[PDB]
Design a protein around this motif. Structure first.
Motif, short mmCIF file in Angstrom:
data_model
loop_
_atom_site.label_atom_id
_atom_site.label_comp_id
_atom_site.label_asym_id
_atom_site.label_seq_id
_atom_site.Cartn_x
_atom_site.Cartn_y
_atom_site.Cartn_z
N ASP A 229 40.39 63.22 39.77
CA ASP A 229 40.23 63.00 38.33
C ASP A 229 39.57 64.33 37.73
N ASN B 11 47.88 56.17 38.53
CA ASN B 11 47.00 56.62 40.03
C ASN B 11 46.67 55.13 40.84
N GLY C 168 43.72 54.25 41.82
CA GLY C 168 42.18 54.37 42.05
C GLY C 168 41.80 55.67 41.81
N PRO C 169 40.29 55.78 41.83
CA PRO C 169 39.62 57.09 41.75
C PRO C 169 40.15 58.34 42.28
N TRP D 231 41.83 50.33 26.79
CA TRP D 231 41.31 49.67 27.70
C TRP D 231 41.51 50.52 29.18
N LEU D 232 42.54 51.48 28.95
CA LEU D 232 42.61 52.24 30.16
C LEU D 232 41.80 53.71 30.15
N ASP D 233 40.96 53.79 29.16
CA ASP D 233 39.95 54.85 28.86
C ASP D 233 39.09 54.78 30.27
N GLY D 234 38.76 55.78 30.99
CA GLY D 234 37.89 56.03 32.25
C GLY D 234 38.36 55.57 33.61
N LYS D 235 39.88 55.23 33.34
CA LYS D 235 40.70 54.81 34.62
C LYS D 235 41.74 55.74 34.75
N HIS D 236 42.14 56.37 33.78
CA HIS D 236 43.49 57.21 33.71
C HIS D 236 43.23 58.63 33.13
#
Length: 164
Positions: free
Chosen positions: A84, A101, A103-104, A120-125
């Motif tokens: 990421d 993805n 996961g990280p 809600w996908l912020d900080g995940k994708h």
């Protein structure tokens, strides 16, 4: 300047039009370059003849699995997976382009386009661009989508590349 890339889309037996995307190489240069290079096929592989394997109307469409064709695979220009890059860009509304993805630090080739503010996908994708033209083409895909995401007819990237 920020790269401008395109997909020509075919839905079932009909050409649907062209999606044009601007890539945020100013913020996520590595992630933008991966996508651009997969669009042009310059490394020997990419999105040409790939499909969208999930279409959820009013949520997102997902594609880019050119290795397995079903969402279980893909690869980047950096190898099977890459880190990421950053989470500086937000899923701000219609047309935002982001990395799928598992996961990280598992970015490959798979990506999605949100058709709503998927915040809600912020900080995940990792967000890396936006649709700038052909919003109607992204919306056309809903005709073969479903709430579960199952695609009813092939949605194929017939052609892809980079524009001036």
């Amino acid at each position: 300047n920020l790269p401008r890339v395109f997909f020509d889309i075919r839905i079932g037996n009909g050409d649907a039009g062209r999606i044009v995307m601007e890539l945020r190489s100013d913020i996520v240069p590595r992630t933008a370059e991966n996508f651009r290079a997969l669009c042009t096929g310059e490394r020997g592989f990419g999105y040409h003849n790939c499909c969208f394997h999930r279409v959820i109307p009013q949520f997102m469409c997902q594609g880019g699995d050119f290795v397995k064709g079903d969402g279980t695979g893909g690869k980047s220009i950096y190898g099977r997976k890459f880190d990421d890059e950053n989470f500086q860009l937000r899923h701000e509304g219609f047309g935002v382009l982001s990395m799928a993805n598992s996961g990280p630090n598992t970015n490959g080739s798979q990506f999605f386009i949100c058709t709503t503010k998927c915040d809600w996908l912020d900080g995940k994708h990792v967000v890396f661009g936006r649709v700038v033209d052909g919003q109607n083409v992204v919306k056309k895909m809903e005709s073969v989508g479903s709430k579960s995401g199952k695609v009813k007819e092939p949605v194929i990237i017939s052609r892809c590349g980079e524009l001036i």
